Design an enzyme around this catalytic site. Structure first.
Site, PDB file in Angstrom:
ATOM      1  N   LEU A   1      -1.828  10.888   5.607  1.00 20.33           N
ATOM      2  CA  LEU A   1      -0.584  10.419   6.200  1.00 20.33           C
ATOM      3  C   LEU A   1       0.076   9.402   5.281  1.00 20.33           C
ATOM      4  O   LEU A   1       1.289   9.400   5.121  1.00 20.33           O
ATOM      5  CB  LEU A   1      -0.794   9.857   7.619  1.00 20.33           C
ATOM      6  CG  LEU A   1      -1.206  10.807   8.754  1.00 20.33           C
ATOM      7  CD1 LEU A   1      -1.563  10.028  10.023  1.00 20.33           C
ATOM      8  CD2 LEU A   1      -0.143  11.883   9.031  1.00 20.33           C
TER       9      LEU A   1
ATOM     10  N   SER B   1      -0.827   6.764   1.612  1.00 20.47           N
ATOM     11  CA  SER B   1      -1.738   6.495   0.493  1.00 20.47           C
ATOM     12  C   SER B   1      -1.212   5.349  -0.365  1.00 20.47           C
ATOM     13  O   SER B   1      -0.425   4.526   0.117  1.00 20.47           O
ATOM     14  CB  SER B   1      -1.921   7.752  -0.364  1.00 20.47           C
ATOM     15  OG  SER B   1      -0.668   8.176  -0.871  1.00 20.47           O
TER      16      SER B   1
ATOM     17  N   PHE C   1      -2.802  -0.210  -1.001  1.00 17.18           N
ATOM     18  CA  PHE C   1      -4.167  -0.712  -0.749  1.00 17.18           C
ATOM     19  C   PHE C   1      -5.209   0.392  -0.420  1.00 17.18           C
ATOM     20  O   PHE C   1      -6.354   0.359  -0.938  1.00 17.18           O
ATOM     21  CB  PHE C   1      -4.159  -1.852   0.299  1.00 17.18           C
ATOM     22  CG  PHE C   1      -4.908  -3.110  -0.148  1.00 17.18           C
ATOM     23  CD1 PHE C   1      -4.535  -3.794  -1.322  1.00 17.18           C
ATOM     24  CD2 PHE C   1      -5.973  -3.615   0.607  1.00 17.18           C
ATOM     25  CE1 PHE C   1      -5.228  -4.960  -1.741  1.00 17.18           C
ATOM     26  CE2 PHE C   1      -6.677  -4.779   0.202  1.00 17.18           C
ATOM     27  CZ  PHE C   1      -6.301  -5.450  -0.972  1.00 17.18           C
ATOM     28  N   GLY C   2      -4.808   1.367   0.408  1.00 14.98           N
ATOM     29  CA  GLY C   2      -5.697   2.473   0.791  1.00 14.98           C
ATOM     30  C   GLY C   2      -5.031   3.753   1.285  1.00 14.98           C
ATOM     31  O   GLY C   2      -3.857   4.024   0.998  1.00 14.98           O
ATOM     32  N   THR C   3      -5.803   4.531   2.038  1.00 12.37           N
ATOM     33  CA  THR C   3      -5.395   5.849   2.518  1.00 12.37           C
ATOM     34  C   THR C   3      -5.552   5.923   4.042  1.00 12.37           C
ATOM     35  O   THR C   3      -6.536   5.403   4.579  1.00 12.37           O
ATOM     36  CB  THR C   3      -6.276   6.944   1.885  1.00 12.37           C
ATOM     37  OG1 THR C   3      -6.667   6.541   0.563  1.00 12.37           O
ATOM     38  CG2 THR C   3      -5.538   8.271   1.804  1.00 12.37           C
TER      39      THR C   3
ATOM     40  N   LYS D   1      -8.556   4.897   8.630  1.00  9.00           N
ATOM     41  CA  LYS D   1      -8.109   4.028   7.539  1.00  9.00           C
ATOM     42  C   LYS D   1      -9.247   3.633   6.594  1.00  9.00           C
ATOM     43  O   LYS D   1      -9.865   2.578   6.752  1.00  9.00           O
ATOM     44  CB  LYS D   1      -7.308   2.809   8.032  1.00  9.00           C
ATOM     45  CG  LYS D   1      -6.926   1.831   6.904  1.00  9.00           C
ATOM     46  CD  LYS D   1      -5.624   1.076   7.122  1.00  9.00           C
ATOM     47  CE  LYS D   1      -5.794  -0.142   8.027  1.00  9.00           C
ATOM     48  NZ  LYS D   1      -4.694  -1.121   7.826  1.00  9.00           N
TER      49      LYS D   1
ATOM     50  N   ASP E   1       2.690 -10.876  11.791  1.00 11.26           N
ATOM     51  CA  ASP E   1       3.366  -9.835  10.987  1.00 11.26           C
ATOM     52  C   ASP E   1       4.103  -8.785  11.848  1.00 11.26           C
ATOM     53  O   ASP E   1       4.050  -7.575  11.554  1.00 11.26           O
ATOM     54  CB  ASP E   1       2.396  -9.124  10.030  1.00 11.26           C
ATOM     55  CG  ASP E   1       3.124  -8.406   8.860  1.00 11.26           C
ATOM     56  OD1 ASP E   1       4.326  -8.710   8.566  1.00 11.26           O
ATOM     57  OD2 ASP E   1       2.486  -7.538   8.215  1.00 11.26           O
TER      58      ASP E   1
HETATM   59  N1  LIG Z   1      -2.719   5.183  14.133  1.00  9.52           N
HETATM   60  C1  LIG Z   1      -1.861   5.806  13.302  1.00  9.52           C
HETATM   61  N2  LIG Z   1      -1.323   6.974  13.658  1.00  9.52           N
HETATM   62  C2  LIG Z   1      -0.451   7.598  12.847  1.00  9.52           C
HETATM   63  N3  LIG Z   1      -0.064   7.124  11.645  1.00  9.52           N
HETATM   64  C3  LIG Z   1      -0.535   5.967  11.171  1.00  9.52           C
HETATM   65  C4  LIG Z   1      -1.492   5.225  11.988  1.00  9.52           C
HETATM   66  N4  LIG Z   1      -1.818   4.118  11.289  1.00  9.52           N
HETATM   67  C5  LIG Z   1      -1.117   4.154  10.126  1.00  9.52           C
HETATM   68  N5  LIG Z   1      -0.357   5.272  10.050  1.00  9.52           N
HETATM   69  C6  LIG Z   1       0.556   5.645   8.933  1.00  9.52           C
HETATM   70  O1  LIG Z   1       0.243   4.920   7.745  1.00  9.52           O
HETATM   71  C7  LIG Z   1       1.321   4.047   7.396  1.00  9.52           C
HETATM   72  C8  LIG Z   1       0.735   2.785   6.810  1.00  9.52           C
HETATM   73  O2  LIG Z   1      -0.308   2.351   7.671  1.00  9.52           O
HETATM   74  P1  LIG Z   1      -0.842   0.845   7.505  1.00  9.52           P
HETATM   75  O3  LIG Z   1      -2.308   0.914   7.145  1.00  9.52           O
HETATM   76  O4  LIG Z   1      -0.404   0.021   8.706  1.00  9.52           O
HETATM   77  O5  LIG Z   1       0.044   0.493   6.183  1.00  9.52           O
HETATM   78  P2  LIG Z   1      -0.412  -0.228   4.793  1.00  9.52           P
HETATM   79  O6  LIG Z   1       0.803  -0.235   3.879  1.00  9.52           O
HETATM   80  O7  LIG Z   1      -1.688   0.404   4.272  1.00  9.52           O
HETATM   81  N6  LIG Z   1      -0.703  -1.879   5.256  1.00  9.52           N
HETATM   82  P3  LIG Z   1       0.078  -2.369   6.738  1.00  9.52           P
HETATM   83  O8  LIG Z   1       1.316  -1.550   7.055  1.00  9.52           O
HETATM   84  O9  LIG Z   1       0.476  -3.791   6.424  1.00  9.52           O
HETATM   85  O10 LIG Z   1      -1.065  -2.134   7.707  1.00  9.52           O
HETATM   86  C9  LIG Z   1       2.085   3.813   8.688  1.00  9.52           C
HETATM   87  O11 LIG Z   1       3.450   3.479   8.487  1.00  9.52           O
HETATM   88  C10 LIG Z   1       1.972   5.187   9.293  1.00  9.52           C
HETATM   89  O12 LIG Z   1       2.935   6.059   8.697  1.00  9.52           O
HETATM   90 MG   LIG Z   2      -2.564  -4.117   6.337  1.00  6.48          MG
END
Ligand SMILES: Nc1ncnc2c1ncn2[C@@H]1O[C@H](COP(=O)(O)OP(=O)(O)NP(=O)(O)O)[C@@H](O)[C@H]1O
Ligand SMILES: [Mg+2]
Length: 304
Positions: free
Chosen positions: A23, A25, A28-30, A50, A142
């Site tokens: 979804l 990448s 920081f991660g995937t 995550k 945040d």
């Molecule tokens: N529970 C979930 N269900 C569906 N999509 C998700 C979910 N969690 C994260 N995503 C997708 O992944 C994107 C980034 O997730 P997230 O880990 O929150 O972002 P990040 O840039 O890694 N750090 P942050 O946004 O600060 O947490 C989100 O905008 C969604 O598009």
């Molecule tokens: Mg985060």
């Protein structure tokens, strides 16, 4: 003072769940879309997974466990659900899948189909989530539209607890921060209210960037000048005034989340009187695969 925290942390076997698609990448991660089958239970639960960057540097592991700790301890319809953790080479976080993604991308993508009813209901729902966090004395730090997820167009939840802390504890999204937090690193439930204001403005402008092209360094000055974000075109003075209250210098002069629930809720009973949107009256807003008899949303999967 402080009650014992008896939340259960669930550890999940790698074999209980299949990844299925990426979804998000980079950075920081995937995050993957997947299905989770708890052991012998005859249920399949759609989930997001995550798993951080393969680099297993101790710094990163401590941050994801902080999230798990916060998310294991919350339980509210408008706050994201943690299902458990997986302790493979790097720690995987398993949450309820929010199929429509983040609210920022969703407003950006569906501009022409979003009516006043949905905008105001989201404001109510986010205020409820935030009020619940306040009851549990968590300061989120945040809140932003990128941190709200969409289970359905009618149901959103606050996410991203990796900066959350308790009110008091002492342990950088500049354009969302209350002035006392930019200046003195003070963080209260009332600094969360400031950020709520910005998040609302992001929704009311269908995804605009606040202070678009204004370098972070300037921001505290602008605010000190008395400048604030401008009135979005769809906003009546009634709605915009709520935003502006969330942005008062005197933190205690801002609304409480419980008042925000009340005000937006009155507005949501007559949405066209409060938001003025071209074509509002005509706006309207099929799951996984074939073997989907046993699918259960996380919200219907309860644990003793
Ligand atoms: N529970 C979930 N269900 C569906 N999509 C998700 C979910 N969690 C994260 N995503 C997708 O992944 C994107 C980034 O997730 P997230 O880990 O929150 O972002 P990040 O840039 O890694 N750090 P942050 O946004 O600060 O947490 C989100 O905008 C969604 O598009
Ligand atoms: Mg985060």
């Amino acid at each position: 003072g402080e009650a014992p925290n008896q939340a259960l942390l669930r550890i999940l076997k790698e074999t209980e769940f299949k990844k299925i698609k990426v979804l998000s990448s980079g950075a920081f991660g995937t995050v993957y879309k997947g299905l989770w089958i708890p052991e012998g239970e005859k249920v399949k639960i759609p989930v997001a997974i995550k798993e951080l960057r393969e680099a297993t540097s101790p710094k990163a592991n401590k941050e994801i466990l902080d999230e798990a700790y916060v998310m294991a301890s919350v339980d509210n319809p408008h706050v994201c659900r943690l299902l458990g953790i997986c302790l493979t080479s790097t720690v995987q976080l398993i949450t309820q899948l929010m199929p429509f993604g983040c609210l920022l991308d969703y407003v950006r993508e569906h501009k022409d189909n979003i009516g006043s009813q949905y905008l105001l209901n989201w404001c109510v729902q986010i205020a409820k989530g935030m009020n619940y966090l306040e009851d549990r004395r968590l300061v989120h730090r945040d809140l932003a539209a990128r941190n709200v997820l969409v289970k359905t167009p009618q149901h959103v939840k606050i996410t991203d607890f990796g900066l959350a802390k308790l009110l008091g504890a002492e342990e950088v999204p500049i354009k969302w921060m209350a002035l006392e937090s930019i200046l003195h690193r003070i963080y209260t439930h009332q600094s969360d209210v400031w950020s709520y204001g910005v998040t609302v403005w992001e929704l009311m402008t269908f995804g605009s960037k606040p202070y678009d092209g204004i370098p972070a360094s300037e921001i505290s000055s602008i605010l000190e000048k008395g400048e604030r974000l401008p009135q979005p075109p769809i906003c009546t003075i009634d709605v915009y005034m709520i935003m502006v209250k969330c942005w008062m210098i005197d933190a205690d002069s801002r609304p409480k989340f419980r008042e925000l629930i009340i005000e937006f809720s009155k507005m949501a009973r007559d949405p066209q009187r409060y938001l003025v949107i071209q074509g509002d009256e005509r706006m309207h807003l099929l799951m996984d695969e074939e073997d989907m008899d046993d699918v259960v949303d996380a919200d219907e999967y309860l644990i003793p």
